[PDB]
Ligand binder design. Structure first.
Ligand SMILES: [Fe+2]
Ligand SMILES: [Fe+2]
Ligand SMILES: [Fe+2]
Ligand SMILES: [Fe+2]
Lengths: 345, 345
C-alpha cells in the first residue's frame, strides 16, 4: 500500500507560446548554466572515499570503517538512510526535468543546452547514491534488504512535484530542493565530524559541495526569468508556495510503515539535520536572492503574489517553530531500516 | 572526447491520432502487461546475493568471494563490467520510455497503466546495477574509479535509439534489448559456473530471469499492436531493422579509449557472451514470435516490408559468419576497467 498523491493531475499550465522563451534562451543556457557542470575528468568518484578493494589495506580499511560506525548512533543512521534513499530515486528526478515543456529532452541524446544539463546533472547525482550506498552496506549498522525494498517502492511510486510541465514552476522547485539537500548533507557532515568520523564527514561534505553548484545554476535560470517576465515568474513562485514544496521522497514506504516519510522527517527535525525552520529559511533566502521584494511593474495580481511571497517566510517561521508536541513528547519507534531497533521521534 | 551520435535527430514520426489508441489500450495493459511485474514483497533484492554486513560471517564471506574471483580471468571481467555499466545507465532507459508519445508519464506519477509499468520496470532494473556494482567492488579485480568515470560519461551522453517518440518503434526496440540482455546475462551466468563460481552464476541468472519477464510483457504489446495496426507494425519493424538496433551503451567512453564499445563488444563476441550471430537469432525469433510471415491483408509497401523483414535474418547470418580477422587474428589490448591489463580482442 505505497502512499499515493492526494491531488489532481494538472498538466501543462504554462502557455504553449512561452516555450519559445526557452528555445530562445538556449545559447544563454550554454554560457551561464552549463559552466556550473564539473567536467568528468575533474570530478570525484565514489571510489575516492571508500575502502580500496584493489589495495593490501582493504581489510583494515573496512574494519576501521566498521569500528567508527559503532560509535555512530541509530538516530543518525535513520537520517543518513533516508538521505541515501532519496538520492537513489534518481531516475524519477531526471524524469521530472524531462516533463518540463520548454526544456525537455525529446530524444534522450538531444544537443540542446537544456538536455545536456539534464543528462550531465543526472550523471553527477548518480555518484551521490552510489557512495552513500556502498558506505551504509559496509557499516553493518543497517538492514540493506529493507532499504532496497524501500527504494523499489519509491521508484515505482515516482512523484508529482506539482510543477505542471512548467519550466517556471520546475526551476523554482529544483532551486529549493538543491538548497534543501545542501543543508541536510551539510548538517550530517557537521554531526558526523563530532561523532568522531572525519571520513564520513568528507563523504557528506563532498556530496553537499555538488549540491551548491546545482543550486547556483538553478537560481540563475530563475534570475533570468524574473528579468524576462517578473510578473509570471512571481506568480509561479507564489503558486508553488500555496501548493507547498513537497519533498521528492514523500511517498516513502518500506512495506510496513505507512507514515515512513513523516517518521523519518521527525528524526531529522529532532537531530537538527533538516528542521521545519529551514523550509522557511530557504524560502527567505530565495526571496532575497531573486529580490522578489525589489520588483516593479507588476499587475494587481502580481502585486498580490509578490506581497504574499515576501510575507510568507516570517509567517511560517512563527507557525512552524512553535512545535512542542512532537518535539519533547515524541514517542520512540522502530525502523525496519535498522532491524526494527527504536529511536525517539 | 565522448562519442556523439552520427545521425540527424528525427522526432514524432508517429501520426498523432494514433496516440488515442494507447489511451484506449490503458485497461488492456492493466490486464495483460502489468501482470508481468513481480510485486516488491515477492522480489529478490541485491542483499540476497551479497555478503551480509550484519552477520558474523561477513569477513569469511567477502574473503571467499575474493578467492573465487581470482579464478575468474580478466576477459570475463571486461564483459561483466560492460554489462554492469550498461545496467547502471538506467535513468536514460526510463527517459527513453517517457519520450514515447502515447505511453509517456506526463507527471512523474501518472496513474496510467503505461506510466505504472515505466516506473515499476525501472524499479526492478535498479536492483540489477546495484547487485553487479557491489559484486565487482568486493572482487578487487577491477578499477572502480575508471568504471565510475565511464558511467558518468555514459549517463551524460545519453542515447538515441532512433525510436522517434513512436511507441511502435519503441516497443520493438525494447523487446529486442530485453532478449539481448537475457542472453548476455544468461551466458555470463553459464560461464561463471564453469570457472567454479556458482554464487556469481546465481547472481547473473537471477538478473536474466527478470529480463525474460520484461521480454514477455514487451512482445505482448507489439503482439496486440500487430492486431490493431497490422500494416503500421510491419513498417515500424522494418524501419528499425533498416536503421539497425543500436545498443544503449554504444557511446561508452572511459576518458581514454575512443572505441570502448567496439573493444568491449569484441571480447564479448570472442567469449561467446553476445555474438553478432545473436543479433540475427533475436531478429529471427521476433519475426517468428509475432508471426510476421503470416500477416495477410497487407498494403503494397507493407508487403515490401514484410518480405524484407522475413529475409533479413538468414542474410545477416551469412553476412555475419565471414569473420576471419575480428576474433581469430585479434590483437591484445588494455582496458582501464582492469588497471590497463590487456586481454585479446
Ligand atoms: Fe544529490
Ligand atoms: Fe543536486
Ligand atoms: Fe537489466
Ligand atoms: Fe529488463
Amino acid at each position: 500500500m505505497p502512499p499515493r498523491e492526494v491531488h489532481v493531475q494538472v498538466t501543462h499550465s504554462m502557455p504553449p507560446q512561452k516555450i519559445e522563451i526557452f528555445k530562445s534562451l538556449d545559447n544563454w543556457a550554454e554560457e551561464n548554466i552549463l559552466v556550473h557542470l564539473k567536467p568528468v575528468e575533474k570530478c570525484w568518484q565514489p571510489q575516492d572515499f571508500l575502502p580500496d578493494p584493489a589495495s593490501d589495506g582493504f581489510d583494515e580499511q573496512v574494519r576501521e570503517l566498521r569500528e567508527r560506525a559503532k560509535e555512530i548512533p541509530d538516530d543518525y543512521f535513520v537520517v543518513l538512510v533516508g538521505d541515501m534513499i532519496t538520492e537513489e530515486a534518481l531516475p524519477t528526478y531526471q524524469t521530472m526535468l524531462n516533463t518540463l515543456d520548454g526544456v525537455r529532452d525529446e530524444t534522450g541524446a538531444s544537443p540542446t543546452s537544456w538536455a545536456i544539463w539534464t543528462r550531465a546533472w543526472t550523471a553527477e547525482e548518480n555518484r551521490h547514491g552510489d557512495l552513500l550506498n556502498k558506505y551504509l552496506y559496509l557499516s553493518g549498522r543497517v538492514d540493506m534488504r529493507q532499504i532496497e525494498k524501500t527504494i523499489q517502492y519509491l521508484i515505482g511510486s515516482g512523484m508529482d512535484p506539482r510543477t505542471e510541465n512548467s519550466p517556471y514552476l520546475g526551476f523554482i522547485y529544483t532551486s529549493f530542493q538543491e538548497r534543501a539537500t545542501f543543508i541536510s548533507h551539510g548538517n550530517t557532515a557537521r554531526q558526523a565530524k563530532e561523532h568522531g568520523d572525519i571520513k564520513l564527514a568528507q563523504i557528506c561534505g563532498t556530496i553537499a559541495a555538488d549540491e551548491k553548484r546545482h543550486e547556483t545554476a538553478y537560481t540563475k535560470i530563475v534570475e533570468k526569468l524574473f528579468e524576462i517576465d517578473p510578473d509570471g515568474t512571481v506568480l509561479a513562485f507564489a503558486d508553488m508556495m500555496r501548493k507547498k514544496i513537497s519533498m521528492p521522497a514523500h511517498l516513502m514506504y518500506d512495506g510496513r510503515d505507512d507514515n515512513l516519510f513523516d517518521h523519518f522527517s521527525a528524526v531529522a527535525q529532532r537531530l537538527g539535520v533538516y528542521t521545519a525552520k529551514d523550509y522557511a529559511d530557504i524560502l527567505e533566502f530565495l526571496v532575497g536572492r531573486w529580490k522578489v521584494d525589489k520588483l516593479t511593474g507588476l499587475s494587481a495580481e502580481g502585486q498580490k503574489a509578490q506581497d504574499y511571497v515576501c510575507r510568507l517566510p516570517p509567517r511560517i517561521r512563527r507557525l512552524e517553530e512553535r512545535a512542542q508536541g512532537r518535539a519533547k513528547e515524541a514517542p520512540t519507534m522502530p525502523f525496519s531500516w535498522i532491524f526494527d531497533r527504536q529511536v525517539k521521534l
